[PDB]
Design an enzyme around this catalytic site. Structure first.
Site, PDB file in Angstrom:
ATOM      1  N   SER A   1       0.785  -1.237   0.000  1.00  0.00           N
ATOM      2  CA  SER A   1       0.000   0.000   0.000  1.00  0.00           C
ATOM      3  C   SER A   1       0.813   1.281   0.000  1.00  0.00           C
ATOM      4  O   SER A   1       0.286   2.343  -0.325  1.00  0.00           O
ATOM      5  CB  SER A   1      -0.954   0.029   1.196  1.00  0.00           C
ATOM      6  OG  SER A   1      -2.267  -0.300   0.793  1.00  0.00           O
TER       7      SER A   1
ATOM      8  N   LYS B   1       0.792   3.560  -3.118  1.00  0.00           N
ATOM      9  CA  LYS B   1      -0.324   4.424  -3.499  1.00  0.00           C
ATOM     10  C   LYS B   1      -0.023   5.907  -3.719  1.00  0.00           C
ATOM     11  O   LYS B   1      -0.548   6.512  -4.651  1.00  0.00           O
ATOM     12  CB  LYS B   1      -1.475   4.264  -2.497  1.00  0.00           C
ATOM     13  CG  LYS B   1      -2.085   2.867  -2.507  1.00  0.00           C
ATOM     14  CD  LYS B   1      -3.124   2.663  -1.413  1.00  0.00           C
ATOM     15  CE  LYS B   1      -3.653   1.235  -1.447  1.00  0.00           C
ATOM     16  NZ  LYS B   1      -4.529   0.893  -0.288  1.00  0.00           N
TER      17      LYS B   1
ATOM     18  N   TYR C   1      -2.322  -3.396 -10.196  1.00  0.00           N
ATOM     19  CA  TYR C   1      -2.245  -2.897  -8.832  1.00  0.00           C
ATOM     20  C   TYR C   1      -1.468  -3.853  -7.928  1.00  0.00           C
ATOM     21  O   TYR C   1      -0.691  -3.413  -7.085  1.00  0.00           O
ATOM     22  CB  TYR C   1      -3.654  -2.690  -8.266  1.00  0.00           C
ATOM     23  CG  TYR C   1      -3.679  -2.422  -6.774  1.00  0.00           C
ATOM     24  CD1 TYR C   1      -3.109  -1.266  -6.240  1.00  0.00           C
ATOM     25  CD2 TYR C   1      -4.243  -3.345  -5.895  1.00  0.00           C
ATOM     26  CE1 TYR C   1      -3.098  -1.037  -4.865  1.00  0.00           C
ATOM     27  CE2 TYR C   1      -4.237  -3.126  -4.524  1.00  0.00           C
ATOM     28  CZ  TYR C   1      -3.661  -1.973  -4.012  1.00  0.00           C
ATOM     29  OH  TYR C   1      -3.638  -1.770  -2.649  1.00  0.00           O
TER      30      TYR C   1
ATOM     31  N   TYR D   1      -5.990   6.086   7.481  1.00  0.00           N
ATOM     32  CA  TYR D   1      -7.434   5.869   7.436  1.00  0.00           C
ATOM     33  C   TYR D   1      -8.334   6.734   8.305  1.00  0.00           C
ATOM     34  O   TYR D   1      -8.246   7.957   8.258  1.00  0.00           O
ATOM     35  CB  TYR D   1      -7.708   4.385   7.681  1.00  0.00           C
ATOM     36  CG  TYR D   1      -6.977   3.514   6.689  1.00  0.00           C
ATOM     37  CD1 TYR D   1      -5.644   3.162   6.898  1.00  0.00           C
ATOM     38  CD2 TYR D   1      -7.586   3.111   5.502  1.00  0.00           C
ATOM     39  CE1 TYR D   1      -4.934   2.442   5.954  1.00  0.00           C
ATOM     40  CE2 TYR D   1      -6.881   2.392   4.547  1.00  0.00           C
ATOM     41  CZ  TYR D   1      -5.549   2.064   4.785  1.00  0.00           C
ATOM     42  OH  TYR D   1      -4.797   1.384   3.859  1.00  0.00           O
TER      43      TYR D   1
ATOM     44  N   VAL E   1       1.384  -3.818   4.247  1.00  0.00           N
ATOM     45  CA  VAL E   1       1.278  -5.048   5.043  1.00  0.00           C
ATOM     46  C   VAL E   1       2.539  -5.895   5.153  1.00  0.00           C
ATOM     47  O   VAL E   1       2.533  -6.922   5.828  1.00  0.00           O
ATOM     48  CB  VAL E   1       0.124  -5.961   4.556  1.00  0.00           C
ATOM     49  CG1 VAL E   1      -1.220  -5.292   4.852  1.00  0.00           C
ATOM     50  CG2 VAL E   1       0.277  -6.262   3.067  1.00  0.00           C
TER      51      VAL E   1
END
Lengths: 398, 398
Positions: free
Chosen positions: B64, B67, B191, B243, B261
């Site tokens: 992630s 991104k 992705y 988040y 992760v």
């Protein structure tokens, strides 16, 4: 010559003031019938300068823009732990959801929404404080940062207390969950008087600058708030100030802010400037139409954006002079981590593993605990290399 | 002497590394069986220094943390309007809610959640680009900022493609709403390979520093990204990176970040430093346990917090010398609004309403459009006061 910024501001007033969309707050006459043809802007620098234009000296009730200041006061009087048990840090809309209190936290989301502001007011002086003490504490904190004794506009207070059902609803729900201890009517009365404190666009800019400097009043240089408290207040202004539209606002404007229904907008950009804007008419979501517009402009035209880095860095080192057997190291500016790290780089960049190093702190304006500790460590290490280190520090700052 | 920061980092590794709570990502073997006894930290300065400790050179899939880089690339290749039609700016959790697409926007909330990252990948090179082109564009942007050709770890890619139902679900829902045009399987494959790009703690710190400087690579000084694009990416990292816990994170740590992760955490503090942390085990919400802990520490011990202002300010003025009939004004540092405003104050602080002013820009490292325009205006005004202004600028920067 004349300073160009106040003229730039004057232009914005003329450009953005060419139109006047939206409506004034309709919930009360005093705000509804207010003269809509008023518009002022004010920018306060960390060094004490104040540039303005338009109606920057017209008084108006601060309203919700009072939330960050009472929050700062509460943090100072009760400590982080006591305030954090009653007020969260989660951004959210003004619309109330009981489920937020049902969480194991049992506390309103944050200090920028009404529920959070009521919980904050209740914490203002201490557990045994009187209604009067807490209210004067709100006025005092706001006055100390503005630089002048501020007054409450009782005409607004009374008009608002006649239609305070929503706030009484929030206060009563908070008591049922244990967030408030005193009566709903009492805490609501304090919060409403608090929102009725009169201020000008210039007061907000000055007030915002105190926050922007870590709690240092720009006009006196005196410390009004511990920096860890200012850091917290500006953080919450950033994540919750403009409610659930804080994400778009952080991206599009990047200026920590809070608006009030009287047309005022408070801005505080850490290390750079305090902003104050005034313009009665509100957009569809309750913020000053032109006030919001003016902020987007200052951000775009001058790049006054939180994500726009501006730091001393290597400039912390005015110059390195290798005279002969000794090195002269002159420092300057506001030395924090960024500068200190650079000064450490300079010391390391010397082959000492030169028989004497002289640290000149005459050009330095100040240094935080992080800078002192880091530089102090660089001195210990230099000496350990069998190098002589003499710190020429006139105004004992080290 | 030796630089103290890398030693401070070494201590953190030993202190925080004394325990190893949490679990590795269980959804795939390659991540689940990964050696948990690894922990590295790296800080990159804007000037090109790189301090690290522990396993800062061990490769691991970026996940992630990829991104913000693909988002930057999309903004560069398509323009703000085209990307903003498909990707919002509203912070939100990873849990998907179709209602977010039903909004008149018809777009996933932001670029840090999986749905937003898929929409971003689809935009990567242009409307007619091939699966291959978009994937290499992802790798290229990440490589350009890291400073080296990066590689995809196909073992992870394959393990992940075998259990990619959730992402296929998000991609299929996006197509139904028109956010994706190509096939669900195609965009998900891109992705997932993108998330499999290998990097080290040091790559992340360097990469983060590029963002922290407005798009200037610290090691070469070359501009990799327009500053308005970096500003946007770091803004969204701040409001959505961590988040719905972004509010507490902004307050408690104040460092724009994104975790993966595999144990990696990316940090980018505008104007001050890039951070890279690596530690396989994840806490209850999916972020690197110690990675998150290390960030809170750097923030508290060094005051590396977004709300902690650090700016050139008045130091932009090295010194004012009134020789006789002429004034010598020497400038320095990175002059942006903050410094420029201060230089304007200096000019105004002269009674010219002195027959010649000399602007020395030798000590200045650079100046942005805002600074040039502001200073250029101060020169026009000085001259208008019948004053002679000569700008001694060696490396034509004005």
């Amino acid at each position: 010559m004349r300073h160009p910024i106040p003229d730039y501001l004057a232009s914005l007033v003329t450009e953005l003031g060419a139109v006047n969309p939206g409506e004034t707050a309709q919930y009360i006459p005093v705000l509804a019938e207010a003269d809509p043809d008023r518009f002022g802007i004010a920018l306060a620098t960390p060094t004490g300068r104040l540039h303005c234009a338009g109606d920057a000296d017209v008084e108006f009730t601060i309203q919700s823009a009072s939330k960050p200041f009472t929050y700062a006061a509460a943090l100072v009087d009760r400590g982080f732990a006591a305030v954090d048990r009653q007020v969260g840090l989660n951004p959210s809309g003004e619309a109330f959801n009981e489920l937020s209190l049902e969480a194991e936290s049992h506390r309103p989301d944050n200090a920028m929404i009404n529920a959070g502001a009521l919980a904050v007011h209740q914490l203002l002086v201490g557990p045994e404080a009187s209604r009067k003490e807490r209210l004067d504490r709100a006025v005092e904190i706001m006055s100390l940062l503005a630089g002048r004794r501020l007054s409450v506009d009782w005409e607004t207070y009374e008009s608002e207390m006649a239609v305070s059902d929503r706030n009484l609803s929030l206060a009563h729900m908070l008591r049922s969950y244990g967030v408030l201890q005193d009566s709903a009517e009492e805490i609501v009365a304090g919060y409403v008087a608090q929102c009725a404190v009169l201020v000008t666009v210039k007061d907000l800019a000055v007030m915002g600058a105190c926050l922007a400097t870590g709690g240092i009043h720009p006009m006196t240089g005196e410390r009004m708030l511990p920096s860890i408290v200012a850091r917290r207040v500006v953080s919450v202004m950033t994540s919750s100030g403009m409610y659930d539209a804080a994400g778009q606002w952080l991206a599009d404007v990047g200026i920590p802010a809070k608006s009030g229904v009287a047309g005022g907008v408070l801005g505080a950009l850490p290390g750079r400037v305090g902003i104050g804007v005034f313009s009665p008419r509100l957009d569809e979501v309750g913020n000053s139409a032109r006030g919001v517009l003016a902020c987007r402009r200052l951000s775009e035209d001058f790049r006054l954006h939180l994500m726009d880095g501006d730091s001393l860095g290597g400039t912390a080192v005015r110059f390195v002079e290798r005279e002969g057997d000794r090195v002269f190291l002159h420092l300057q500016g506001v030395i924090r981590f960024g500068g200190a790290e650079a000064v450490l780089d300079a010391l390391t960049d010397l082959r000492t593993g030169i028989r004497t190093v002289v640290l000149n702190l005459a050009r330095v304006d100040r240094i935080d605990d992080v800078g002192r500790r880091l530089i102090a460590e660089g001195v210990r290490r230099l000496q350990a290399d069998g190098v002589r280190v003499e710190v020429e520090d006139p105004e004992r700052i080290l």
